[PDB]
Amino acid sequence: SSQIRQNYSTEVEAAVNRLVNLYLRASYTYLSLGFYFDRDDVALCGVCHFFHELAEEKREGAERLLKMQNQRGGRALFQDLQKPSQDEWGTTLDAMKAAIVLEKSLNQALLDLHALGSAQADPHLCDFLESHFLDEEVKLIKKMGDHLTNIQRLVGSQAGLGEYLFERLTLKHD
Amino acid sequence: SSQIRQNYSTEVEAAVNRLVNLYLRASYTYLSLGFYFDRDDVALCGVCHFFHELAEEKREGAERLLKMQNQRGGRALFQDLQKPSQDEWGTTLDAMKAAIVLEKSLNQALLDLHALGSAQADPHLCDFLESHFLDEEVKLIKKMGDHLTNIQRLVGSQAGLGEYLFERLTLKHD
Amino acid sequence: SSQIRQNYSTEVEAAVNRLVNLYLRASYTYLSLGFYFDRDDVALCGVCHFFHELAEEKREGAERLLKMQNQRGGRALFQDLQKPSQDEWGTTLDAMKAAIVLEKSLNQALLDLHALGSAQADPHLCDFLESHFLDEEVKLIKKMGDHLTNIQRLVGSQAGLGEYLFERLTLKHD
Amino acid sequence: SSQIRQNYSTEVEAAVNRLVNLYLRASYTYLSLGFYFDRDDVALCGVCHFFHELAEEKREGAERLLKMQNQRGGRALFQDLQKPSQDEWGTTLDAMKAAIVLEKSLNQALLDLHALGSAQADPHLCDFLESHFLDEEVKLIKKMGDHLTNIQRLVGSQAGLGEYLFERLTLKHD
Prior knowledge:
CATH class of chain A: Mainly Alpha
Chains A, B, C, D: Ferritin light chain
PDB class: metal binding protein
Shape of chain A: elongated
Strand content of chain A: under 5%
Oligomer: part of a larger assembly
Organism of A, B, C, D: Equus caballus
Largest sheet of chain A: none
Number of helices of chain A: 5
Number of domains of chain A: 1
Keywords: Metal Binding Protein
Order of helices and strands of chain A: HHHHH
């Protein structure tokens, strides 16, 4: 039961639970991506930090959604977290491409949820998705697109050299 | 007169004045609630601080609305402030129930005003109600619901003991 | 491929991947447990912190196992993460009971893996499970048993009061 | 004579002396490796620091083993230290390959000694090899495998450029 629920549709409640699952799944994908880059036959430190930072960001996003669910009087429902789509992620380029596709899918899910909030006249939901979701997604996708462009320019005829240099000079950590 | 008014409907201007009255009335209710808990035959310090903090928050909300009214070129109009609905507020439980009802009514007034802003295509109003009103209300109502649940679990067969313990261990101050 | 693998059986590699899944599943269970205690109709702050701290600990355990997998030249393989066994977790007592059962299952999985390491004559694995897994589990299970005993002594005839007091006086945070 | 020897087999005592010789020999190999990279016709600063750090680590390992030998009441016996297997070590890649082979041989000697300790029911020996030998070896071999992968990706068609960049950007010092 809840003593607090107000202007919070069952449709939005369900969509929020699905978005939690999508964020957690994204986090799990990023967990796998980072560890792949820590394989001794891959060994790109900076790429591990990049994807693991994202794993943490996605988990935090899910956690924020769950906090909001409870603030509104909705009820968290968890589903299975599907294993990531690949066991091996190819080159830094392949991985960054998969990451952009992943983010675009999360972004579309956010847009769909915002549209649902508008349809349900739920301005708190609208406000919430703004800060910490919509703008963060746009910024993250821009960063990934920038990375992709730099990775692509570094392939040329010497892909190994380019991959090393990108990790050394773009993906620094700490 | 005003030299600044732009995209600010008479409908919104009037609704903002009514919302100021509702916030001030809420502040007055909270003033009364707190002092009731300071009666020598009631004597629950933590409950006084809880409601008096809310009295201050509600007054600040009204003040923000009035500042916004002037920023938009609307004109403040004050009405009587109706005395609070009760002279005596019963138990901490009774009081917390009355407080939740009060807040839900303010929240509904905010939602009605946001809807009016949408209908009048007034995005500044929309932005304004977001921060410092909509999200604050949701958070406050969640806190009150949490309190209610804890108060309710403490009644059992020993209501006096439970009421004392809630004030001592949940409603600490300073 | 790997250029580093030495004395690391396929049996242990597979068992390590399964243990990663078990730790992640435990983390997910704890995520759900904590949020349940943040429902407005449950509202036990200290219990949320307790289970969320464990969610973090379990995720870190999985992460350590994955780091070790790569250090040994094994290959991480992720599987679905099964949703937690319950959507609603009952009383603090019910939850603490479920947590102890969960931990005992993880502990048994650690013991099974240590036995496999002994059978495969893999002392690095043996060393690894020692620190940060075996002793941490024993300590955690002891803490949970202590909590259970205290929760049980607090039920008596006044379960609501006891549940509140345990959260207030045992499960403090920060 | 000794007044302290307890549960310390002559087999383990002898194996410990042989392991001291292997560690010292490894240290000597690393001494040679580093100085080769300081030849004016080789001139790779970072590679000198990398191998000289290892020379120090291996000497310290031998010293720890000798301290333990005396703690157990065994008697140190030194043998000749065979000169390193090469006078000239080729490319950074050739050298890193030779280093991995060297480390794998030390690791195997540690595993053989741990097995002997198990066979002789000597848990102090078991404990000792754990910390500061077994786990350090695994970590070091993982680092070397990572280096090898990076060196290999940098060869491509421009080996000179790749060798310079690895030394500049991976093997920094101080």
